[PDB]
Write a protein that holds these residues in place. Structure first.
Motif, short mmCIF file in Angstrom:
data_model
loop_
_atom_site.label_atom_id
_atom_site.label_comp_id
_atom_site.label_asym_id
_atom_site.label_seq_id
_atom_site.Cartn_x
_atom_site.Cartn_y
_atom_site.Cartn_z
N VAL A 1 0.86 -1.20 0.00
CA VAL A 1 0.00 0.00 0.00
C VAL A 1 0.90 1.25 0.00
O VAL A 1 0.64 2.22 -0.73
CB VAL A 1 -0.99 -0.03 1.18
CG1 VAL A 1 -1.77 1.32 1.24
CG2 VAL A 1 -1.94 -1.21 1.12
N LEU A 2 1.88 1.26 0.91
CA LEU A 2 2.85 2.35 1.03
C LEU A 2 3.51 2.68 -0.32
O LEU A 2 3.43 3.84 -0.77
CB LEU A 2 3.86 2.08 2.19
CG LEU A 2 4.79 3.23 2.62
CD1 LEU A 2 5.48 2.84 3.91
CD2 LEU A 2 5.77 3.67 1.54
N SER B 1 12.85 13.92 -1.45
CA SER B 1 11.65 13.13 -1.56
C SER B 1 11.18 12.49 -0.24
O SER B 1 10.20 11.75 -0.24
CB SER B 1 11.91 11.99 -2.59
OG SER B 1 12.52 12.48 -3.79
N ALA B 2 11.88 12.74 0.87
CA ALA B 2 11.54 12.17 2.20
C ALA B 2 10.13 12.50 2.63
O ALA B 2 9.49 11.64 3.22
CB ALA B 2 12.48 12.68 3.28
N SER B 3 9.66 13.72 2.37
CA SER B 3 8.33 14.08 2.84
C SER B 3 7.26 13.20 2.12
O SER B 3 6.30 12.77 2.76
CB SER B 3 8.03 15.56 2.66
OG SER B 3 8.09 15.94 1.28
N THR B 4 7.47 12.93 0.83
CA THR B 4 6.52 12.10 0.06
C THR B 4 6.49 10.66 0.55
O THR B 4 5.42 10.04 0.64
CB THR B 4 6.78 12.24 -1.45
OG1 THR B 4 6.71 13.63 -1.77
CG2 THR B 4 5.71 11.48 -2.37
N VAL B 5 7.65 10.12 0.91
CA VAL B 5 7.71 8.80 1.47
C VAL B 5 7.00 8.82 2.80
O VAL B 5 6.25 7.87 3.13
CB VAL B 5 9.19 8.31 1.61
CG1 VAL B 5 9.28 7.08 2.45
CG2 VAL B 5 9.74 8.00 0.26
N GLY B 6 7.23 9.88 3.58
CA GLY B 6 6.49 10.03 4.83
C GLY B 6 4.96 10.06 4.72
O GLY B 6 4.22 9.45 5.51
N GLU B 7 4.50 10.84 3.77
CA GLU B 7 3.08 10.92 3.49
C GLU B 7 2.49 9.61 3.05
O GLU B 7 1.34 9.32 3.34
CB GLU B 7 2.83 12.01 2.48
CG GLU B 7 3.08 13.44 2.96
CD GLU B 7 2.18 13.91 4.11
OE1 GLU B 7 1.30 13.17 4.67
OE2 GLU B 7 2.40 15.08 4.49
N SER B 8 3.27 8.82 2.34
CA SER B 8 2.91 7.49 1.93
C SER B 8 2.79 6.52 3.12
O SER B 8 1.83 5.73 3.18
CB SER B 8 3.89 6.96 0.88
OG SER B 8 3.85 7.76 -0.26
N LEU B 9 3.77 6.57 4.05
CA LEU B 9 3.66 5.85 5.31
C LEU B 9 2.38 6.22 6.10
O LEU B 9 1.63 5.34 6.53
CB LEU B 9 4.89 6.12 6.15
CG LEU B 9 4.90 5.56 7.57
CD1 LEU B 9 4.68 4.05 7.55
CD2 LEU B 9 6.22 5.99 8.23
N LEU B 10 2.13 7.53 6.25
CA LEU B 10 0.98 8.02 6.99
C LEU B 10 -0.32 7.60 6.33
O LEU B 10 -1.27 7.25 7.00
CB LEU B 10 1.02 9.54 7.16
CG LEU B 10 2.05 10.07 8.17
CD1 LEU B 10 1.99 11.56 7.91
CD2 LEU B 10 1.69 9.72 9.62
N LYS C 1 -5.23 4.33 6.31
CA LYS C 1 -6.11 3.33 5.71
C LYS C 1 -6.22 2.05 6.51
O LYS C 1 -7.26 1.46 6.52
CB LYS C 1 -5.66 3.00 4.31
CG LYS C 1 -5.60 4.20 3.37
CD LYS C 1 -6.89 4.99 3.29
CE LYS C 1 -7.99 4.25 2.58
NZ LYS C 1 -9.20 5.12 2.51
N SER C 2 -5.14 1.61 7.16
CA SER C 2 -5.15 0.39 7.98
C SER C 2 -5.97 0.57 9.26
O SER C 2 -6.74 -0.32 9.67
CB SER C 2 -3.70 0.03 8.38
OG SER C 2 -2.88 -0.07 7.23
N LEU C 3 -5.80 1.73 9.90
CA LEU C 3 -6.38 2.01 11.24
C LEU C 3 -7.79 2.57 11.23
O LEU C 3 -8.52 2.42 12.21
CB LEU C 3 -5.45 2.93 11.97
CG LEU C 3 -4.16 2.23 12.37
CD1 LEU C 3 -3.00 3.19 12.53
CD2 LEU C 3 -4.36 1.46 13.65
N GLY C 4 -8.20 3.13 10.10
CA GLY C 4 -9.54 3.79 9.98
C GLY C 4 -9.78 4.76 11.14
O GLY C 4 -8.97 5.68 11.37
N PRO C 5 -10.85 4.52 11.95
CA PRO C 5 -11.18 5.43 13.05
C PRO C 5 -10.12 5.49 14.15
O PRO C 5 -10.07 6.47 14.87
CB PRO C 5 -12.49 4.86 13.59
CG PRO C 5 -12.42 3.39 13.26
CD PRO C 5 -11.66 3.29 11.98
#
Ligand code: HEM
Length: 151
Positions: free
Chosen positions: A26-27, A105-114, A119-123
């Motif tokens: 997903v990341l 590009s670190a911020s984009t990788v970070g945003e991808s992690l987040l 998506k995994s955790l939902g609420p």
């Protein structure tokens, strides 16, 4: 890291860590959707991936994902004192240099992690969970950038 942030990070990582490739998938899918210019940086067998989906068919790339997830797991394990991972993380920064990769590009990788976490955790992806992770990711990146540069 702070003692409440530490628990939020451990508890949130639990579900992810059960299926690390599905979640890393997903990341990386998110990453290449946001910034497909990163796709040529992942080259195996002397070949560039044409499309993002091509990456997901590469056992070398999927093995790359497993490495990423293992390192994130290590940062989670050491969240209450990341200095124990400092030298490893600086070495990881050097590696990013060795292969010809800069970290702007670190911020984009970070945003991808987040994104993957959201998506995994939902609420259960609370604002407090998001800031905990952003702080952990930041500290990881700052150790990596030390190694990329002098030190
Ligand atoms: C800042 C933007 C980033 C870019 C563009 C990027 C890109 C890459 C590339 C191209 C490779 C080499 C892949 C290969 O030939 O197999 C690599 C390796 C790696 N990346 Fe990143 N990366 C970034 C940030 C990160 C971050 C923040 C982590 C944190 C976990 C990470 C973890 C790794 C790991 C574990 C490896 C393999 C290290 C090894 O084999 O010794 N990367 N990355």
């Amino acid at each position: 890291m702070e003692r409440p942030e530490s628990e939020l990070i451990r508890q949130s990582w639990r579900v992810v860590s059960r299926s690390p490739l599905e979640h890393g998938t997903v990341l990386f899918a998110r990453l290449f959707a946001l910034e497909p210019s990163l796709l040529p940086l992942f080259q195996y067998n002397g070949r560039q991936f044409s499309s993002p989906e091509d990456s997901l068919s590469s056992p070398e790339f999927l093995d790359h994902i497993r490495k990423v997830m293992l390192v994130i797991d290590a940062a989670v394990t050491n969240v209450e004192d990341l200095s124990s991972l400092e030298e490893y993380l600086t070495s990881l920064g050097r590696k990013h240099r060795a292969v010809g990769v800069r970290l702007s590009s670190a911020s984009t990788v970070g945003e991808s992690l987040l994104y993957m976490l959201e998506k995994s955790l939902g609420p259960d992806f609370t604002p407090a969970t998001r800031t905990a992770w952003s702080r952990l990711y930041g500290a990881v990146v700052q150790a990596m950038s030390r190694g990329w540069d002098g030190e």
